[PDB]
Amino acid sequence: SMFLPPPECPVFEPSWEEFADPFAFIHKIRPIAEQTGICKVRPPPDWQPPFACDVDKLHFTPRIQRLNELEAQTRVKRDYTLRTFGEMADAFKSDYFNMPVHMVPTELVEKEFWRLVSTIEEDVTVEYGADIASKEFGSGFPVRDGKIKLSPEEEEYLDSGWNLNNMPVMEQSVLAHITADICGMKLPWLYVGMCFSSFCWHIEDHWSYSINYLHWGEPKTWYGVPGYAAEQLENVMKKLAPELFVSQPDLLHQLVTIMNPNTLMTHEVPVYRTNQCAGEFVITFPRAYHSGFNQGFNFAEAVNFCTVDWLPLGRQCVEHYRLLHRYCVFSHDEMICKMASKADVLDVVVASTVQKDMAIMIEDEKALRETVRKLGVIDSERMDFELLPDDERQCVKCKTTCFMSAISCSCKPGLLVCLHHVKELCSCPPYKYKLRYRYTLDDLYPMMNALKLRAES
Length: 457
Ligand SMILES: N#CCSc1nc(-c2ccccc2)cc(=O)[nH]1
Ligand SMILES: [Cl-]
Ligand SMILES: [Mn+2]
Ligand SMILES: [Mn+2]
Ligand SMILES: [Zn+2]
Ligand SMILES: [Zn+2]
What we know:
Layout (H helix, E strand, L loop, with lengths): L10 E2 L3 H5 L1 H12 L4 E4 L17 E2 L2 E4 L6 E2 L5 E2 H16 L8 H13 L6 E8 L19 H5 L26 H4 L2 E5 L4 E5 L6 E9 L2 E5 L5 H11 L14 E2 L4 H6 L5 E5 L4 E4 L5 E5 L3 E8 L5 H14 L7 H9 L7 H27 L4 E4 L22 E5 L23 E5 L3 H16 L1
Parallel strand pairs: 1-2, 17-19
Antiparallel strand pairs: 2-14, 3-6, 4-7, 5-12, 7-8, 8-16, 9-15, 10-14, 10-16, 11-13, 11-15, 18-19
Helix pairs in contact: 10-11, 11-12
Bound molecules: ligand H0X, chloride ion, manganese (II) ion (2 copies) and zinc ion (2 copies).
One zinc ion binds next to loops.
């Protein structure tokens, strides 16, 4: 009546054999889970990573959060220890309900969350932690270091595929051999939650997958939307909260919001829910919108990742970003070429998939270069784009991160446009322009061939 809970998302309980390889398992469940956008994974009963921490030495800077539906919030950026945060969080919840924190039904907290964010009268504010691992607050999974000797139990999980520190650097991921500095995206994030602290509706940068583990504490409640419904969700959001779609100045100025899933379901957006309990994984699929809130004091860890399934979507995403003039986190083409340059050490299924994306890349690049030559750009010079700081190689028009090529003019020292935007650089005639290119077509075809050879083994 007030709140109707979405249907439950799929839950998987893999055997140890199924569970052992995360990439194989994810690939297996994909036909099911990509229809719901999120799914939950319960590890085999004895997969039990050790959690040990001194709650008095772990400290972090809390973020503060107002809970109002449709109100704009920014995506990223006082001091608590984990103990004092926990004490604040438990006291907040038990005072809010006049009940012991674990006797509050999850259904009631959910019901109450959607009441309070919708009511103008209520101004509930809460606090939470969000950051990558640091020396003041490290991963919840075991990691190697010289100062501290690990237990056999800890040593056991150092190399698990489901140890999220490993996830980026494994063989079936395509961020395995990448060099670029993208700390925000390839490293796990740590999240300290409290009752009602929430994550707004969003998809991951570059439409990547995410995997999310709840180390300990009260559950995390999720809502998820399949990738095929992303634009329908965005249309609903645009109608109700147009303020969120204004042009973003920087990459750290993305606007996001809380919105009732019933509102989406009313507008024919399929939504699924789940309560993630301690020791369970949630996986989000490419372009799957998700949001949620915490039932109480808890500690989660999450990481982005990209499988071979994702590669063509990664290309479509960058294209989508260009149309929106949205900043990129990294160059997709640069990643592809980096992998091609390491074709000999690539996993062979990876090589095969990269080869297919590269073929599309080369065909598109060939066409774009013919077009800019017909616009009268004649002069050219090789340019090592990967050496430029990222904010020094964005298209002044569409903000895309250049790598394959760009146009420059000595009239505008340091400015670049991608080849879709030759006419947006300056008023000089095109013969004053230079095509800056990373590779000639004669460079590119042998790189692609190396991938083919590797994939033919
Ligand atoms: N999405 C996702 C991972 S779960 C999570 N994510 C957050 C969050 C996300 C973006 C920015 C700040 C916090 C808070 C929290 O409790 N849990
Ligand atoms: Cl409110
Ligand atoms: Mn997310
Ligand atoms: Mn020059
Ligand atoms: Zn451009
Ligand atoms: Zn000029």
